[PDB]
Structure formats: C-alpha cells, structure tokens
Enzyme design. Sequence first.
Site, short mmCIF file in Angstrom:
data_model
loop_
_atom_site.label_atom_id
_atom_site.label_comp_id
_atom_site.label_asym_id
_atom_site.label_seq_id
_atom_site.Cartn_x
_atom_site.Cartn_y
_atom_site.Cartn_z
N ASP B 58 0.97 -1.02 0.33
CA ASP B 58 -0.49 -0.07 0.18
C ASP B 58 0.93 1.38 0.27
OD1 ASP B 58 -1.40 2.46 1.29
OD2 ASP B 58 -3.05 0.95 0.98
N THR B 91 -2.67 6.44 -3.01
CA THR B 91 -1.95 7.17 -2.87
C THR B 91 -0.42 6.35 -4.06
OG1 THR B 91 -1.91 4.97 -1.65
CG2 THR B 91 -2.72 6.64 -0.49
N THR B 92 -0.22 4.84 -4.12
CA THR B 92 0.75 5.34 -5.13
C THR B 92 0.40 5.35 -6.18
OG1 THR B 92 1.17 3.24 -3.94
CG2 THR B 92 1.59 3.26 -6.46
N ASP B 392 -9.22 -0.62 2.21
CA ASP B 392 -9.26 -0.51 0.49
C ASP B 392 -10.16 -0.56 -0.01
OD1 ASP B 392 -6.23 1.33 1.09
OD2 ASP B 392 -5.54 -0.51 0.10
N1 LIG Z 1 -5.83 -6.66 -12.77
C1 LIG Z 1 -5.34 -5.88 -13.34
N2 LIG Z 1 -5.33 -5.23 -14.42
C2 LIG Z 1 -4.44 -4.38 -15.19
N3 LIG Z 1 -4.31 -3.23 -14.42
C3 LIG Z 1 -4.55 -2.83 -13.18
C4 LIG Z 1 -5.34 -4.82 -12.74
N4 LIG Z 1 -5.64 -4.15 -11.31
C5 LIG Z 1 -5.72 -2.68 -11.01
N5 LIG Z 1 -4.76 -2.50 -12.18
C6 LIG Z 1 -4.69 -1.04 -11.95
O1 LIG Z 1 -3.40 -0.67 -10.85
C7 LIG Z 1 -3.82 0.85 -11.23
C8 LIG Z 1 -3.11 1.27 -8.96
O2 LIG Z 1 -3.54 0.44 -8.22
P1 LIG Z 1 -3.27 -0.15 -7.13
O3 LIG Z 1 -2.09 0.72 -6.41
O4 LIG Z 1 -4.43 -1.17 -6.05
O5 LIG Z 1 -3.86 1.97 -6.37
P2 LIG Z 1 -2.91 2.50 -5.60
O6 LIG Z 1 -1.52 2.86 -7.27
O7 LIG Z 1 -3.61 3.58 -5.96
O8 LIG Z 1 -2.63 2.32 -4.84
C9 LIG Z 1 -4.69 1.14 -10.84
O9 LIG Z 1 -5.31 2.43 -11.50
C10 LIG Z 1 -5.66 0.03 -11.90
O10 LIG Z 1 -6.13 0.58 -12.85
#
Ligand SMILES: Nc1ncnc2c1ncn2[C@@H]1O[C@H](COP(=O)(O)OP(=O)(O)O)[C@@H](O)[C@H]1O
Lengths: 530, 526, 524
Positions: B58, B91-92, B392
């Site tokens: 996270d 956040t990432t 989340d």
């Molecule tokens: N199975 C998947 N295939 C392709 N892209 C994905 C998949 N799951 C999530 N993503 C992409 O990864 C990005 C970041 O996911 P995540 O790390 O959970 O959120 P954040 O980066 O905001 O913490 C999201 O914008 C989403 O579009």
Amino acid sequence: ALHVPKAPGFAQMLKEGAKHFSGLEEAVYRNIQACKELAQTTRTAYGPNGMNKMVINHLEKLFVTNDAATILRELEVQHPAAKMIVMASHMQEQEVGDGTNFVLVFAGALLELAEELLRIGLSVSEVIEGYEIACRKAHEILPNLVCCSAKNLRDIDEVSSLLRTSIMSKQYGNEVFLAKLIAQACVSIFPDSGHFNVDNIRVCKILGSGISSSSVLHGMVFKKETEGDVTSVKDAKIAVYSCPFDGMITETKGTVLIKTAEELMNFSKGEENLMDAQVKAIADTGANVVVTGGKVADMALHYANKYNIMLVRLNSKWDLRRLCKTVGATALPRLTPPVLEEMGHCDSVYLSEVGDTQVVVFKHEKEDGAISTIVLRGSTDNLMDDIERAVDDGVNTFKVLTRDKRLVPGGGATEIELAKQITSYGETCPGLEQYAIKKFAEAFEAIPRALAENSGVKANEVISKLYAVHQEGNKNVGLDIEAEVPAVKDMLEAGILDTYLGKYWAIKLATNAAVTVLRVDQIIMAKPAG
Amino acid sequence: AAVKTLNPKAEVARAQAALAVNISAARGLQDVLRTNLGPKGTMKMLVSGAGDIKLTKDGNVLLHEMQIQHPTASLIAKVATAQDDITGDGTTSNVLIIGELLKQADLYISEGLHPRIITEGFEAAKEKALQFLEEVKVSREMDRETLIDVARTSLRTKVHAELADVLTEAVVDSILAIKKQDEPIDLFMIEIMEMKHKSETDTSLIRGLVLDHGARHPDMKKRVEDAYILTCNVSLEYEKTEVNSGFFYKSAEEREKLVKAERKFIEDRVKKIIELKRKVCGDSDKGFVVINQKGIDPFSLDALSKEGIVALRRAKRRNMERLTLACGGVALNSFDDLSPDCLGHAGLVYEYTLGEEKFTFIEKCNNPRSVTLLIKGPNKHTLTQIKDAVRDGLRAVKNAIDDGCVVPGAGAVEVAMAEALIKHKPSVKGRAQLGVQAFADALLIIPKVLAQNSGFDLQETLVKIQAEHSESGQLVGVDLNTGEPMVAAEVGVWDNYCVKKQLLHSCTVIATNILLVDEIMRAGMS
Amino acid sequence: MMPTPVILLKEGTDSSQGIPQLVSNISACQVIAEAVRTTLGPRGMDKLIVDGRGKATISNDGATILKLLDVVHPAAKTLVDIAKSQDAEVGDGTTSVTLLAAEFLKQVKPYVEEGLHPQIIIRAFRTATQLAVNKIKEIAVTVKKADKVEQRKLLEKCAMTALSSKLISQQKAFFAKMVVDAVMMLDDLLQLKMIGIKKVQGGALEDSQLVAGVAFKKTFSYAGFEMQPKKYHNPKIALLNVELELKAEKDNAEIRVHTVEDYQAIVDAEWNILYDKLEKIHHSGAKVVLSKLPIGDVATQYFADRDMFCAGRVPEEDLKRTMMACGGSIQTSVNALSADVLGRCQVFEETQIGGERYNFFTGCPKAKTCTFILRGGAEQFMEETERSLHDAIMIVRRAIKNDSVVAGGGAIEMELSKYLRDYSRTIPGKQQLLIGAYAKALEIIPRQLCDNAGFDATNILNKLRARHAQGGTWYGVDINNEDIADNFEAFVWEPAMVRINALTAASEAACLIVSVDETIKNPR
Ligand SMILES: Nc1ncnc2c1ncn2[C@@H]1O[C@H](COP(=O)(O)OP(=O)(O)O)[C@@H](O)[C@H]1O
Ligand SMILES: Nc1ncnc2c1ncn2[C@@H]1O[C@H](COP(=O)(O)OP(=O)(O)O)[C@@H](O)[C@H]1O
Ligand SMILES: Nc1ncnc2c1ncn2[C@@H]1O[C@H](COP(=O)(O)OP(=O)(O)O)[C@@H](O)[C@H]1O
Ligand SMILES: [Mg+2]
Ligand SMILES: [Mg+2]
Ligand SMILES: [Mg+2]
C-alpha cells in the site's frame, strides 16, 4: 522535514571547506561591499589633513603612516576583490610612487556607483562599457587640463616648489624644509642626461634630535666603524675590493705540506712578508682608504695601520656597489693594487658620531655626484620611517617630472573639471551608457569630498562651490584647507599641483581594477589553509 | 546568501537548487513506489525500530513507514494521506503522477522555460482532463456483480489472489448489508475484528457482531440459542458518592447492616434486569444476554448468573450503536422505565476462546444493518495486511456506490486523457502547450509502470496501446499477463471516478506549487 | 557591524577608531609617564624592576626604566622611543622628555574630547615648540671668554647638576671633578670607548677612583706568572695581537717526514719558532707584554725567567685604551718591534682591588684615555653608579662642544611658560587656547620637583609664576629650603641643548600621537 539538503550536482561535489558564490547578489554585491569597506578603511588618510594610522602586523611591528599603499601592505586583506584593488594600488605605487590613495578612493567610488546602477537595472556589461568609454574620455581630457609645467629640473627653488605638494599630504606641518632637502638631493644626483635613478637617493635614519636637524650629504654614510687606527682622510684615494683583505687562497683544498725544519721555520715569515708586500703595493699606488666587501685579516690590518691606510668593511654587496658608484671606483676581485682608473676619490672620508651612532662618511665637496644621501634625524624610529616614506614620495615625484614635465592643479580642481566635462559628455551620449558615464563622472567628486571631510568642513557645500566656480570658468580652482569654513581658491596660483602621469596612471589603474571586480561573476574559494 | 547573513546557522536552497532538491526527492519517492503499482507489484517488508514487521503493498503505508526526512517527501506524504483519508485508494498513483509531472516539467525548465508557464499549461491540461473524465465515466446501476468486479480490482492489487477472491465477496456482502437505500454509508457500522489462529482464507463475514471479550463469570453459559440482547450503558458495579460521604457505625452489627445497604442502589438495577428477564423468558427456552458499556462487579455478575443471564462488561462506545443496528434493540443509559421493546434478538450467541482471550459471537440476527469482518490469519503482520486490504476494498465499494459512475482501469483512462490532451494542445495559447504535453506524458505514467511491473517494454507496450486507442477509440489498457491491449470495461477492471478526480486535482495542485517553489529555507533556530 | 560570508580582514583584527581611541592613547601615555614621575629631581626615587629570569635592575634613569618596562601599547611605545632618542642625542633629560610629552597630551585631552581638530592641535604644538626653542637659544647664557678655569667651573657645575638626582648625590662634587678631568683629558672625538669604567664590588663611593692611564683585571695567568715581578718603574710596553705558545704552525698545515732526524728537527723547529718570537719580544726592551691572544705557559715561564710581565687574552677595548695611553701600536707581527711601536708609562703595577687583581698603568702623560674604577656594595649599586656617571659624562661632552648654559629647577620651564602665555594672549583665540595649554604643560617640571620633594607645588608655582613676571628668569625650585631661588646663582646649571632636545622630542611625540586617529592590530 527539518533539514535542507545540498542540491544535486556542484553543491554536493564541492569539497568540505570550499565556498561557491554566483550571481549579482552572492558575488558582485559582496565584492563591491568588500571594496567599499577597504576604501573606507583608507579614506580618512587622504590629503594633507589626512590622519595617520598605527597598523600592527602579525609580527608585532608598528607602522605609523597615512601612506595608502603602506597601510594596505601591512593590513592582512583576505577578501579576494579587495586583494585585487590592493594589487591595483601597489601597481600604481610601483609605476608612479604617489596616488595609491587616489586609486583606492576612486575604485571604491566606481564600485559603489556600479552597485547603484546594477540596482537601478543596468547589466554589468553595460556598466563596464560605460566605465571604459568614460575612462577613455577622461584620458582624452586630462592633457587639456594640464595647467603648468616644470620648465627646469636643475634648479632648487623650482624643484622644491614642485615637490612640496607631493610631500604635503604626508608631513603637512613641515613640508618646506623637506622639499628643500629632497630638491637638493635630487638635483645633486640629476645628471646631464635626462635619466634619473631613484636608488641613487639614499636615506640614513639616525636616532636623536629632530627633522629640522636633517641634512643632505653628497656622498654616502655607513653605520660602521673603521677596522684600523686611521679614522680621517682629507684627499681620499679609495681602493675597493670585493675580495676579503686577506691573502688569496685556493678554491681547492689547500694544505701546507712541510717536509723540512727550514720550511717550517720560514713559512710564517714568508706569509707576513707577502702580506706586507701586497699592502705596500696598495699604499704605494697612493691609496689612503681601502674598502673591502669581505673580512679583514689581522696581519693585513696590522700593515694597513703601519702604512696609514683607513680600512672600512662593508658587509653588503649593494653597499659596496653603491660606494663604487659614489666614489668612481671599480671593485677588484683580487688584492692587486688598482690602476689609475680603478681607483675612487672623495674630498673627505672620516669617522663621525651622529648621536649615539658611529658612522663612516664618504663626503664629496662638489655639489654633484652619482649618489646623494639624506641623513634623517628624529625622536622616533616610526617618525623617521614616515619621513622616509615622504622622501620616497618626493623622489618618485621628481622622477615622474623627469619622465613627463606636465602638471595639473590639485586640491580636487582636476577632479571637479573631469567630473564636469564627463557629465557634459554623457548628457550628449545617448543609449544606456549615459548612466554609467555620469556615474564615472560623479566618482571623481569622491576626491574633493574626501579632502573636505578630512579638512573638517561640509563636503556638499565645498563641492557646490567648486562646481559653481568651474561652471563660471576657473579650471584651476580647488578647495582651501587653510579655512575653518568651506572655501576655495586658485590651485595654480597657490602652487598645489599634481603630475599628469600620476593622474593618468591612477585613473587607468583604478578603472581597470573596478572593471575586473565587476567582470567577476562566480567565486570558487578553496578551503583556507590553516 | 541573504538569509545566512542574518541567521548564520541557516540552510537555504535558491532558484535552481530548490527545484533540483524538490524534483530529486519526488523522483526518489517515485522510484521507490513504482513497484507497488498493480497486482504484479512486489511486497515490501518493513521493520520498525522495535523489530515489528509489516508486509505491505500500500502506497500510504509504505510512505509512512519508509525512513525519510525530506521536506518534499513530507509534502507528498501529506497529500497522499489526504487522498487516503478521503478516498481510501490512490496513494501510489498520486505519488507516481506527482513525480512524473515534476520530471516532465524539469525536462522543459532545464531548457530555460519558466515554471510559471509550465504551471499555466498544467492548469489548462487539468481543466481539459477533468472534462474528459466526466465524459468517459461509466454511469452504471451498482449491482452485486459490478461491486464484485470493483472490490476485486482493488483487493487483487493489495493481497494474494486467492485471499482476494475471498475478501472480495466478504467486502461486497458487508457493504450490501449495512447499506440503506439513498443514505450515505457509515463504514463505522462494519466492525473489523482480527483473530490469530487459522489460515488467512478463513476470513469471513459474520452477519452479526463479534466482541473482543466474553463473560467474566465462570458459571455463565458459553452458548445461548434464542437470546434477548440488552444493550446498556449503566454502571453495575459499586459507585461511590460524588460528595465525600463515609460510613459511621457503633457496632459490628451496624457495620454489617451498612455493608448490606451500601449495595442496594446497584442491586436495584440488577433486580430490574432480572425482572425483565423473567418477564420475557418465562422458562429456559430462550436466552438473555446483557452487554454493558460500563463495569459489572462480581456481586452483580453472580446475581445475574444465578438467573441465567450472560453479562459482558466494558463494551465499546461504538459497539453500542453496532449492537442496536445488528440486534435491533435500544441502548440504555438508565433503567428508569425499561420495557421488552428495549431488547434485541440474536438467533445465536456463543463464546470462543483463543489462548488467553475470549470472543463473543452474536449471529443469526433478523436483518442486521451492522456486521463484522473476522480477519483470520496466522501472523500479526498477515492480519495487518488484510486489515489494510479490507479498508481499501470497503472504501472502493463505498465510492463506487456513492458515485454511481465508474471509470475503466489499467491505465485506460490515462491513455485516453493523454490522447485528448494532445489533441487539445493546439487550442492553448503560447508556450503552455509544453505544460500540456508534460501533463499528458505524466498521466501516461500509470500504463508505463503497469507494464514495467508486469515485465514488459514500456515504450513498445505504450505505443501499442495508444495505437489501438487511436484506431478504435475504445478505452483500452494493459493486460498484465500478455502485454497486449485489453478493454478494461469488458474485462472488468474498474477504478473509482472519485479517485481519478482526486488524483487529477491534488496531483496538479501540489506539482504546481512545488514547481513554483523557488527557495527552501530553514531558519527557525534560535 | 554585520556578518559577511568573506570578511575583508583576517579574523581577529581589532580596530579602535576615533576620539575614544585618541583619548585612550593619551591615557596610556599618562600611565607611561606615571611610571617614571617619581624619579625626577634631587628628591627623586629609584625603581626596581625584575625580569623573567629574576634579575633585578635598580635605576633612576628614565630611559632605562622604560626600556625595562615591557611596553606594548602602540601609542605608549612612542614615549619609550623618545626617551631612547633623548638618551642617545644628549644623555640626560630622559625623565623630563617623557613627563613633558605626556603633559602636553594631558593638557590637550579636553579639546580632543570636545572635537578640536588634531591638525589644529599639532599646528599649535609646532608653533609653540619653535617659539620655545628659539627663546632658549636666545636667553641661554654663553660666557664668551674661553677661559680655562671658567670653563672647568662650568663643566663641574653642569656635571654636579646632572648628578644631583642619583644615589651618588652625596659625592657629586667628587664624581663631577673626576668626570670633568676625564672628558677634559679625552681627545677631540670625545670617544666614549676611550673612558673605561671598571666595577669592582667592595669599597665605598669615595674609595672609587679615576686612573689617568688604563687598568684592567688580571686575565687567566698560567704557571710562572707568580714568579714574574709585579711592579715596574719605567717600563716599555709591547702591545701585541699574537698568540705566544706551542701550537700547530697553521691549521691546514701537515708535516711529512720519513726520518727520525727530520722528526727531531721538526720538533726543535717548532720550539725555535716560539723561542724566536719570544727572543724578539725580549730584545725589543719591553718589560711588559700584553697580547690580545693567549700567552701559553711556556711563554709565561720564559718571561718570568727574563723578569718580564706578560698578560694574554686582554680584551680589545682595554688593549686599545692601553695603546691610546702609553703611545704605541698593536702588533700582529713581532718582527719589527721598534721604540715607535712600543708603549711607555711611568709606573706599571698589579695590585689587589677588593678581591680582584688589577693591572695599573699609571704615569702616562700623553694619555688621551682614562679608566674609572667604581666601588660599591652590590652589582646594581655599581651599575647605577655607572649610569649616573654616563649621564654626567655625556652632559660634560655636550657642554664642552657648546658651553651655552641655562638654569634648572624648572627655571627655564617657568620662563618659557611665561613667554608662551604672553605670546598666546596676542593671537586670534583658537591657537590661543592651545598655546596656553602648552604653557600650562611646561609647568610640569617644577610641579613634579615639588611633588617628589614633599612641598606644596601649588604655592611654589604661584611664587614662581609671580617672580618670573616681575622680572627674573633663573628663578626655580629650591629643594633644601622648600622655597624658590635664583638657580643660576645657586649653580643649578643645565646645558641648553638638554632642554632644546627635550622640547623637540616631546612635541614631536605629542604631534605623532595626536595625528594617529586609528589603531589596527593584526592577529599574530
Ligand atoms: N488486473 C489488473 N489489470 C490491469 N490493471 C490493473 C489491474 N488491477 C488494478 N490495475 C490498475 O492498477 C492501478 C493501481 O492499483 P493500486 O496499486 O491498487 O492503486 P494505487 O496505485 O492507487 O494504490 C489502478 O489504477 C488500476 O487501473
Ligand atoms: N595644500 C593643499 N590643499 C589642498 N589639497 C592638497 C594640498 N596638498 C595636497 N593636496 C591634495 O592631496 C591629494 C594627495 O593626497 P595623498 O594622501 O598624497 O593621496 P595619494 O598619495 O594617493 O596621491 C592630491 O590630490 C592633492 O590635490
Ligand atoms: N640641585 C638642584 N636643585 C633644584 N633642581 C634641580 C637640582 N638638580 C637638578 N634639578 C632639576 O631636576 C630636573 C630633573 O633632574 P634629573 O632627574 O637628573 O633629570 P632626568 O631624570 O630627566 O635626567 C632638572 O630639570 C633640573 O632642573
Ligand atoms: Mg601623495
Ligand atoms: Mg489500490
Ligand atoms: Mg637628569
């Protein structure tokens, strides 16, 4: 979030104790501030009313003077821009001998006005352009500001009146006496050829009495005694040897190889007979005074006393060379009697006691020669050193007059006329250069301003009076220090004059120093060793 | 410099120094967090100064646990913390987009472009991007299948795949249970209890409540079938008088009478409870469970046990509401006039001991508007990881419900917004077109990092995807298993419109302010 | 007064500027004067200073005291320097010069504080100094008779005055007669190296003596020196720079023989070299032999057998004095020992003088040299006696060269103060105040005399100021009567050059100190 990190790149790659300054703020303005502080340290010494300073150097030596270049030398200036201004001042001292305080004042003023112009919005390039064109205009103008000329450097009243001004800034109270002395010396050693050597004026500082007991001596004085029994001579026939007054020996190791009682018995008697022969040949050449640059042997001294020869030992080789120049002799590397040309002559050579000090005097009676000495009396070593510096100023002024006989009015008259004319030129010059031209002009005002401030009067009233009189047309008018109120008078008619070459070189060097300080944009100091 | 002439012990970064410092720190954060992005991201292990272990993917957790003392890093951590507090996810991506905006702006600022002009272009591009986002958002009836796809899209990034297939159903059912039509979702009404005994795939949704304590009297039953639940906030232990009183007696008999009398006040409340119990349960068929937010002394516990009541003491101020929403009674601060209508019903109540701790399950409620997620796992760090993941996922489903729209994921919206910004650029006046281009290439960091983390060539994959989106116009993204383009809306990879909007807004603003910072200065020292 | 990233000067540079710096300079000069005030005059006291090595110096001489004080103040060093300059040029007045300079500074201190321009102050100082010097040269009494008895009276009186401040004041007539005989027996150059001053611990001041000749201490005799005689009644004297002993004929000399006959010949040859030197010295008729170089035991015994006297390692100055007294020349070779190069005296003796043995050459009538032999109960006693006699000798020399006498006890200072007050009351009014301050400063000499004596300087200065304005120029402090008196009739005489140089040096020091407006100390 409690620490600002060094930025990536040069800030991180910089060594530990090194410093880096860049830009108008960190570099240019700080340099201008340093040079301004320097000019402020030396401003209060400018002019006849300038006060002395007592600088103590790291060696606990005391200097009491108002000579700008001396003060700068004895200060430990550590800021590099100030060091550069000091380099300019020392180059002025070397080239001319007077005007170092002018160089300092003018450079500091140029830099202050350059800071002002940079703040109003000009670029260092434009400031430098304007400063250069205005310096060129000043150099074009000064020859027209030349008022009088020497017209004779073999006289003693004219030369004294000419050196009085240069020797007034230093030793203001008593300058007519000193100008008389220095004029006597300079015109004594001034040859029929137009070449004048400043090293031929010697200065002997002897403790006791005071500056009014000082005198000029056509010859030489050495704080020495005589090696032998003779102390006076009235028709000197001096013979000068760079070799010791001893029997010549081999440069390769010499050994007295005895193999018989006869050789052993006769060696010393033969040595003494040889020494007697050598000194008797010297005495029979007519020489009554011998001056050796090396040591004296006991037997040779014995026989010199026997044959009534005054022996003198000059440890220094410069002393030996100058004595040779004085008396007209040639230093012989062998103890061979001198030929009629290698011998020197003096109307008298005697041992005297000036004060507590014993001295040997080679005195000519004629009012000429290759070398003259000024015997400075005084109640303090510091006082006598200051008077020696004033003598140096007067002698360098004499040489500048031998080089270029032109003179400009002092007391700020030339400075005010320059300021006026360069302002009038900048008012006609269009473009952004006019600001820098006008500031270069206003910088000249710093000279009469410093004179007035030290005289003890309102510099603004003085400068307004000067501007009014120079507008109505009198270019030889400058300020009167002999006035409790702001006043002005004819510098020419008063006899207060400077040297065209002095002003020329001072302006040139001050402008070059300021322009270099401005051309600096980044500074990368290394870790101060120590 | 200027400040160091007044405060000699002052640290200062001016013009270029400041910008280099800030952009370097931003790129460092981005380089650390690049690996968190997506389900193919890598798990980091974080060891506290005490030795405690955290396993996280996270962005916010990683930020706060990393060991950093940089001002720009603090700024960006705070922006991410706000993103997490309001949306729960993003956040990432927030940190990545900030870092990439700063980098793409430095690309043009090193060539003498002014940061003010770059920020003007950033503002124009932000406007156009928000418009395009509103255009592309997919307004959908939030059915269980859509919510399942959303929660999967989040949990598969945050945890292992099988645990994500479990937590998805858990989170979606919890939200679909505590949700009332057209009424903002109170996530407080979803308790989250962790137990440390079994495998992580045993994490379940209890359609009721789980209290982290049990009965303190041994004679109290450990299992109750048809239970009347009394949620109270009334002290049942000995209370001393507010004004200092004290007892005065002249004989041991008087002392005994005073000892028996001093408890009459609490005995009366116990009697009220016991009388209600007798009135509602005339026999041992049903059960009676008292849950007190305050204490219960041994005498009251004994008195209630004798009558067959299960009493829990010192419950939670939130458990008061959670119990009145699950069971369906009334939480009481006084027994002045208590009635059988003040009671709730639970079709089963029992106790579970785990080593030295006890838990109380309250299940088989009628229609509980409050539930609990029981986080089972073999390690404290596993439990913490699952707690973060369910946070989340709950935030994700709540946001997808609130905003009935949902945006395609896998960098699809980022690709499309980049194309739209690049086609919009000519309409921008002056050299702010470069700021627009920088914004577009910064938005393009999400598909780039997704490819980088799946193990593909960033440039080749991104060119393929942009080509497919320009040729077809479909919102297409990265397939993390083949590196080919895929339609996120068709394959069920969804992101939150609120999350994307917050990204655009906060990232643009913080990047603008950082670019416009021209002097970093620490001079507070005395 | 603000920090800079790079400072103009080296860190640690202390700069004192302005009126405060000037007033502090004046105060330091006041301190330096205070350090010597109490030595002034017949009632003056001595100072005891001790060095780091623990050796004490006891002196009434202001130049000595100030040299010994480790003065480091740049402005207060100037008073020490002018005291040195006075001791150089004149030899007396060293305390007066410092007192006068410091008093000039003190007197102008108020105007300096009130912002009077130092240039103005120094101009006034120069003017008043020139005036006072010309007035001294004008009113100095110079008897134009060139009489020998009157010139000896004059020298004796000037010497008695110069000595009436020391620890030999109770013998000042004695010592003045001796100093006068000495400088009157010197040659035209009046060389100080031609007057010898021996210090023999033990004996009384009256037991001290002057030798119309030369005298020096016995010099490391070898065996046989006691076999030598110790009195000669008309000796001829061989003065030599010759080492008389068996030695390597030369340091780079190497003998090489391959025969024992040659070996023995060489040994006998060394012996014959020495014996031939000795035989020449013996045949020259010289009964006394002095060598600047060692005289070995063999030569000692040779001379003892010939009934001659020998002394080696004689110091160069004592040899030169023996030469100037007996009338010969110093010989590096003994091959021409003629009567022209031999010396002669009427009596030579070796006597005991207070634990030491001294050789006396007496009876030299052509002697242009003399040797003082000073007795006393301590090293520093004899040193302060020598310093007093040096003062007296320098005074007598200057008087011989210019017998132009003024009166002392502050008479001349009061006369000049009157003259300068008169002159100042005739000028605009700015220079008036400063020249009046100069005048009031000149009064520090009689004031300090009365102070050190224990009188009421106020009343005595009132008496003097009154008597000098009524007509009368040589009235000054009378110490034994606690009153005033005509010091020219009381014979408190002082060469004019003393006060001339005192005023010159003090005014120059004051002008310098007042012209300094800033002090910059660099870090060491
Ligand atoms: N199975 C998947 N295939 C392709 N892209 C994905 C998949 N799951 C999530 N993503 C992409 O990864 C990005 C970041 O996911 P995540 O790390 O959970 O959120 P954040 O980066 O905001 O913490 C999201 O914008 C989403 O579009
Ligand atoms: N009597 C005087 N009246 C007015 N000005 C004078 C007088 N004498 C000298 N000056 C001025 O003093 C200046 C010389 O000052 P000085 O200390 O010598 O500086 P520098 O040594 O740098 O030339 C000259 O410019 C001259 O005009
Ligand atoms: N017998 C005397 N009576 C009165 N005054 C005297 C007598 N002898 C010396 N003085 C005065 O004492 C002053 C200083 O004496 P002294 O201490 O010897 O001078 P310094 O220490 O400066 O050499 C002189 O100015 C002189 O006038
Ligand atoms: Mg000059
Ligand atoms: Mg996520
Ligand atoms: Mg005296």
